[PDB]
Amino acid sequence: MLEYSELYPIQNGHRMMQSLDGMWKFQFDPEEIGEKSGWENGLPAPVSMPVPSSFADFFTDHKERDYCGDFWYETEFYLPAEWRNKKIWLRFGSITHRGTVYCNGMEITSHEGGFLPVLADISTVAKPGQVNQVVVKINNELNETSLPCGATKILNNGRKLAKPYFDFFNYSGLQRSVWVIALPEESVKDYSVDYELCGTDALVKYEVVTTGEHPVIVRLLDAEGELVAETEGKEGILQVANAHLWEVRNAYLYQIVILITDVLDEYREKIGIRTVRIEGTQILLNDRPVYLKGFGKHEDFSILGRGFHWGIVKRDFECLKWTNANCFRTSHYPYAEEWYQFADEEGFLIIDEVPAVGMMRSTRNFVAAGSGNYTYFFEALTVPELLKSHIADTEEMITRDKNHPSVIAWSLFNEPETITDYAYEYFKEVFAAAETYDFQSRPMTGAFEKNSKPELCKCYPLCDFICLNRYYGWYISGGPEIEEAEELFRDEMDRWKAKELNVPFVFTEFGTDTMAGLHKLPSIMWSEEYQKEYLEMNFRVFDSYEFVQGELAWNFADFQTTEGIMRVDGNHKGVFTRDRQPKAAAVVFKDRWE
Amino acid sequence: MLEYSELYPIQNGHRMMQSLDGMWKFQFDPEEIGEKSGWENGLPAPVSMPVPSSFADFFTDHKERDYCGDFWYETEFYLPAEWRNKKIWLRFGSITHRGTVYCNGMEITSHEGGFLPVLADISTVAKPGQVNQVVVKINNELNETSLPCGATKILNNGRKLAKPYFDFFNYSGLQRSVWVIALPEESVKDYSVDYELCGTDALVKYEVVTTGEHPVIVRLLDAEGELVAETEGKEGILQVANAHLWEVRNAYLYQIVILITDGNGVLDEYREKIGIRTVRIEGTQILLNDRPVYLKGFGKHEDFSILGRGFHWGIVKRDFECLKWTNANCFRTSHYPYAEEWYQFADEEGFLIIDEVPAVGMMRSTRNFVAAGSGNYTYFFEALTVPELLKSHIADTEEMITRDKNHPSVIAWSLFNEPETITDYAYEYFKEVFAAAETYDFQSRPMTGAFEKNSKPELCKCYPLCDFICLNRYYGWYISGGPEIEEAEELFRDEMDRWKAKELNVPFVFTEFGTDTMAGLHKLPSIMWSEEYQKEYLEMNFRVFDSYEFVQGELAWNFADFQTTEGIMRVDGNHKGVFTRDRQPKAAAVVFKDRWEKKN
Ligand SMILES: [Cl-]
Ligand SMILES: [Cl-]
């Protein structure tokens, strides 16, 4: 279990917080001489770099956009003098992909994983009342011992080029907000809630972790601040009579309030009373079935790359609502915590995905996810280091996101090898670990490439429901062969039906690249009309199987990828353009999903 | 003299700040009932709204995008206990266009002007160690008594529709960051610096304004932190030996430090970075640090996909990397003061700025870009609304100058863009604006504005007031375009020959010239709207500029495609950008890069 708290920062009497967002100093370190040359003390010749954002798309030259290797940030903040006697942490929403944090010259901690928060305890070096310095050494290379997976090519000048095993640009930097926070010396470290429904009434079971021994009181407030339940102890049950349940696209948020007393700490968070259970082939939310309708997405916008902005969230949610979606998948990595906060208010359902993408050794991975070629990926001697990373990223993800009502499943892989017992052994461990970290035991899943065929795949028995990525009519029998493609699709769904697994299937990826404004009569692959015809055919197949309980189309919006001959300025399978405007097919979803 | 400080917020022991950026609560008020119905105490049915951002582009239906009238924002912040016995202010970078601030139920203050900071003293109503509430009524209508000017149509169902007299979309709301801050009870309110060059040495003349009577000392620190000058007094001269001047695209910044002292103690401390440099017009020449400068760059807009005018540092970083690749040294803040961060960063990068008050649309026309050369006068400055418009024009000027005057990057004030000037009612109007501006600026730096074609040499009455003359011309586009471009050139030269013959002996800058250019539209031979036509229009206008000794700058229109109100002459905004709205370059962007690499 973890040496820090994953809880979002708040500001009350006992807990303080100050934003470090703004313009930082930035400098590339291509010869990797920073540590030995005093950069922990300040950067020798930096530039200005916005935070949060991704560094790549600001520059005007290739070597800098495509930089791969070591690079540094530095900034300076004044701590209020009133934060003596408090524990003081730096909280980075993310450090992509790995980094060591230095503060006032001292190395505080290093982290691996570029999509989950990083906590640095600077209590012993922070100078309250004075100006303080923070310096972060970051690395954005890809390998097969960390997620997401890939490789690093050295070119003739010795400069490094990222060669990912995934299909999305390797944005990196400090992409999410950065805080400095003050906690009490005895503090709430973690807590977990589970829900039971008793007719109209409800139980909120909870457990609490603290950095101390003092008694804990837990209060639960309704939307208007009035009290509805109170229990003493670090373990308890809250009784909410005539409970107001969090519903799909109709949220109700209670407020939990955790206290440590003699009052030493207070933590407050919005939660939603709802239950998630798989009965047979159905997904039950509050004991009634739900059908998932929505999109795979990316944290991706012009200029900012993966940088968080609230304006992107607002628009992306006003578009999801306009299509009448109810659900999205945080593909292929946990998002910024603000996305889940807002999903909670709006009643969207989230499949939360750990970044286990790239577990097949292929640099053009999307044509290759149906080629039939096994890459011997889980037979290699780096696999134990990889497994340790994957489990640690699952643990940090679940701890961070488990108390959001919108999060209803965990996706623990996208398009890996599953056709050999080497991969069963691997994934069995991962699921085992995820089952222990989630106090609610909500459904665990992953998304399968076409190569994980019903006859050969070893891993679908680990899944509570099964997610399929399928491109019938695009990478398989596309264009004039599109009727062959429908058959082949039905052929496979027939074989899955024949297995009588009695579990739900969700299509988590299907789509066509579509250039906005390419019209052709008759339609051709890449036009707007072909996208509509494609979707109308996948819909017919989905609607032919009682156990298909969900469609998450790929993608919500055009996004940026590694450049290559099959990628025309990124990936054009969006239903919206990258500036968040709808292609002709968005209307297809809107109508179907009403 | 203003009842508050325009000084950007800092965080030291004496001064603390807290950001309120985030999701605020938002609610439209089409019936205009919020105050009588208690919205000052919280909104009844809100939705969430990013701050900073313009609200318009988030929504999916026209009624909300095109909303005009009253609308309300609300949030809640915790004030640390330790801020008892401090003066506590809310500081909005901007409230667009007018608004009334409420804090814990109480009307604190009102403000008119959508593009400069709003300061609201909440010291008597703030509750430290408790959670506090802010609520703002905003109105984004346009009128003829405030800037920028327009009108307001009432549709048949009672809906208000904005009808601006300007060519940009009427984005509005809380478009810039918002802070709550704590100041000392005796604080630095204001300061001003002027400079004189003394060979290897330099003088920094200054003056400080405080809110009490304890004494001031002023320190000056070089770039590396070391003390290079010190002076007691609220008015002084700092003596910098072996000064590092601030130079175009080669910036050096000192830190100035202003203390209010209680003998051996410190009451207040303010620090800003500044840059020693001098600006002077000598004849037809624009002298920076005693050498001539040719202005090369762009008129810009605070504009970006989804965010509207919302401020983001990444828009800044990208926009400056593009300006550097272009080899520009200049830009004008058309047509309103920008977020302060823009100027802070121009100081680090050494760009020259022309700072523009929002005095645009002073001529009644709703399709006003076909009408800046039409020849039709609209009696704009004889209306009885004009004395009110003058007062808020001066008020915005004083507020812009007080805010921006200490940036090295700011070399001149633009006080109008394309107004009617062919009339003595207009001379009498602008004599007052300029007289006002002269007083608020401690550096008496150059004042100008930008003239439409309508303001001909023989008819214009306002160019005498200008230390240099900015022209917006579109010969080869709105006038005599496409096949007739040969004629557009002779017409252009004929106008310039008349300016020449006046022998005014002042510098002329071209602040607008451009062609709508659709990215990707290629024609051989070229046609108006093709990328090829943009390049040729430009090569033509450069030949004209270069024929006149007194032309000393060229700011092309626009850096980037930007959003306007819609209509038949506007294909999803304005397409005179040299870059796209997503900040990639059309073919005429290298025309600039090459010309400007090889100028000075
Ligand atoms: Cl290059
Ligand atoms: Cl509509």
Residue numbers in the entry:
A (entry chain A): 1 to 262, 266 to 597
B (entry chain B): 1 to 600
What did the authors write?
In an attempt to gain insight into the structural and functional diversity of GUS enzymes, we recently reported an atlas of 279 unique GUS enzymes identified from the stool sample catalogue in the Human Microbiome Project (HMP) that clustered into six structural groups based on their active site loops, Loop 1 (L1), Mini Loop 1 (mL1), Loop 2 (L2), Mini Loop 2 (mL2), Mini Loop 1,2 (mL1,2), and No Loop (NL)20. Here we present the crystal structures of the L1 GUS enzymes FpGUS, LrGUS, and RgGUS, as well as the NL Bacteroides dorei (BdGUS), and show that LrGUS and RgGUS exhibit unique active site features not previously seen in L1 GUS enzymes.
Three of the previously characterized L1 GUS enzymes, EcGUS, SaGUS, and CpGUS, were singletons that did not group with any other GUS enzyme, while EeGUS clustered with two other GUS enzymes from bacteria identified as Eubacterium sp. FpGUS clustered with the new L1 RgGUS and three other L1 GUS enzymes in a group we have termed as the “L1 Cluster”. FpGUS, LrGUS, and RgGUS share a similar core fold with EcGUS, with 1.7 Å root-mean-square deviation (rmsd), 1.7 Å rmsd, and 2.0 Å rmsd, respectively, over 576 Cα equivalent positions. For RgGUS, this may be explained by the alpha helix motif adopted by Loop 1. Docking pNPG into the active site reveals that the alpha helix motif would sterically clash with pNPG. Therefore, the propensity for the loop in RgGUS to form an alpha helix may explain its low catalytic efficiency. In contrast, no crystal contacts were observed within 25 Å of the EeGUS L1 structure. These findings suggest that while crystal packing may dictate the L1 conformation in some GUS enzymes, it likely plays a minor role in the formation of the L1 alpha helix motif in RgGUS. The alpha helix formed in the Loop 1 of RgGUS and predicted to form in the Loop 1 of FpGUS may block the active site of this enzyme for productive binding to this substrate.
